[PDB]
């Protein structure tokens, strides 16, 4: 059976999988949760992910709960012989290596940020201490970038959709003036035709923080 | 070229590796980078790793900076074809998504209380907050082990060397005595020699913690 993706299009994870089905060509069968809404504590999806989290991929009997897995799950489903998730095993472990850079470092800073904001009103939030925090992680990935057009080496991989998304979600906040090889990458991942799927939840991101947050973005 | 593993031993990440290691008899270099002291941020480790994080894996000129990476590195390069990290499509992502539930959801409210700590001081920190925080992420782990007898299946795999670590960081602090399948896993995985690799860093870090928090972890809570 087509695999299904509950989503909600706001976050960047689930922004990461959009692009990569788009980028695949991926029949997939889109079920928006709205997490501002609470729904994904719903009882049923609870019974299906007990994290409560999107991006949640079903497909047949594997239910995957994290966007990284179902970045690779897809990619060996629908792209063997691809260059996104690279079969050797040295340039696979430097594609996964990034990825959990982008969850445990880069989305795990923003998301403290936004979720600070989410929860405490942007006046409330310590945004230099978020500021601080988030300019390390661009530094991190200007050096990533260093003789390298792309987060993992020379050719796009998951990790450059994984962290693209987030990455384009800061970037609501604190510009890339500073780090001109990280402007380069993001300008190029932008002329990417599957870029087109992180547009419409970045926006629609931006416009739930400033309602539920009380402010406006630089 | 033989690993080199960049540690400190306090650490749940780096205990997951640790006892990997000990599990299939790696011959590892060992080097310690003690977080306390904030060794991760002399001018040679961020070089090698921007991000000042242990565990950090140099093999050959192969640089992993994450422990989920290097658990998955490691098992197949020393147990090539083995079940620790599965052949089959479907059950290597059950374990890969286990893998990310400990680095999400698991170690990141395990982290994110224990740094409070650290940097407030125990009775500074909502307490109650993060106990609600990280009970629901024994909830959670109880839910997975409803369904099966390990973590990710009905076998050993690295989702539970990477979730124990922290698990038992946690419940140094908070009981599982409503838990009985966490509580069962838990004493199985206490069972194997491997379990070694994680007794003594724990220790540590239990310890360090109580120094540096100025309070004392409830000897009545860890199984
Ligand atoms: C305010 C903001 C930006 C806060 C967020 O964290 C997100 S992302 C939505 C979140 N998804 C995950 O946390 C999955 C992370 C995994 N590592 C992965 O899939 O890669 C989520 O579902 N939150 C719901 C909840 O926790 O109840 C966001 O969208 C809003
Ligand atoms: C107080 C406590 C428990 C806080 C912690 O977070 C840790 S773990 C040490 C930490 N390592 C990582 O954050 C790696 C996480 C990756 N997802 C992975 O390898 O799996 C670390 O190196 N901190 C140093 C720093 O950030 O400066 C801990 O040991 C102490």
């Not at 970037?171 to 402007?183: D, G, I, T, V």
């Not at 629609?204 to 400033?210: A, G, S, Y």
Request: aromatic share 10%.
């Amino acid at each position: 059976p087509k695999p299904i993706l509950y989503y909600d299009e706001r976050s960047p994870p689930v922004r990461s999988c959009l692009m990569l089905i788009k980028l695949l060509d991926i029949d997939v069968e889109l079920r928006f949760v709205n997490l501002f809404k609470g729904e994904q504590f719903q009882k049923d999806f609870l019974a299906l992910n007990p994290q409560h989290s999107v991006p949640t991929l079903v497909h047949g009997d594997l239910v995957l709960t994290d966007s990284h897995a179902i970045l690779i799950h897809l990619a060996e489903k629908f792209d063997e012989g691809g260059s996104l998730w690279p079969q050797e095993h040295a340039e696979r472990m430097k594609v996964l290596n990034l990825l959990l850079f982008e969850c445990s470092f880069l989305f795990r800073r923003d998301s403290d940020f936004m979720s600070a904001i989410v929860r405490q009103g942007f006046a409330n939030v310590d945004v230099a201490h978020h500021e601080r925090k988030l300019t390390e992680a661009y530094i991190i990935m200007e050096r990533y970038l260093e003789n390298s057009d792309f987060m993992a080496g020379p050719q796009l991989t998951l990790a450059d959709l994984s962290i693209v998304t987030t990455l384009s979600t800061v970037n609501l906040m604190f510009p890339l003036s500073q780090f001109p090889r990280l402007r380069r990458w993001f300008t190029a991942m932008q002329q990417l035709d599957a870029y087109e799927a992180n547009c419409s939840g970045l926006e629609k991101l931006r416009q739930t923080m400033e309602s539920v947050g009380s402010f406006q973005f630089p």
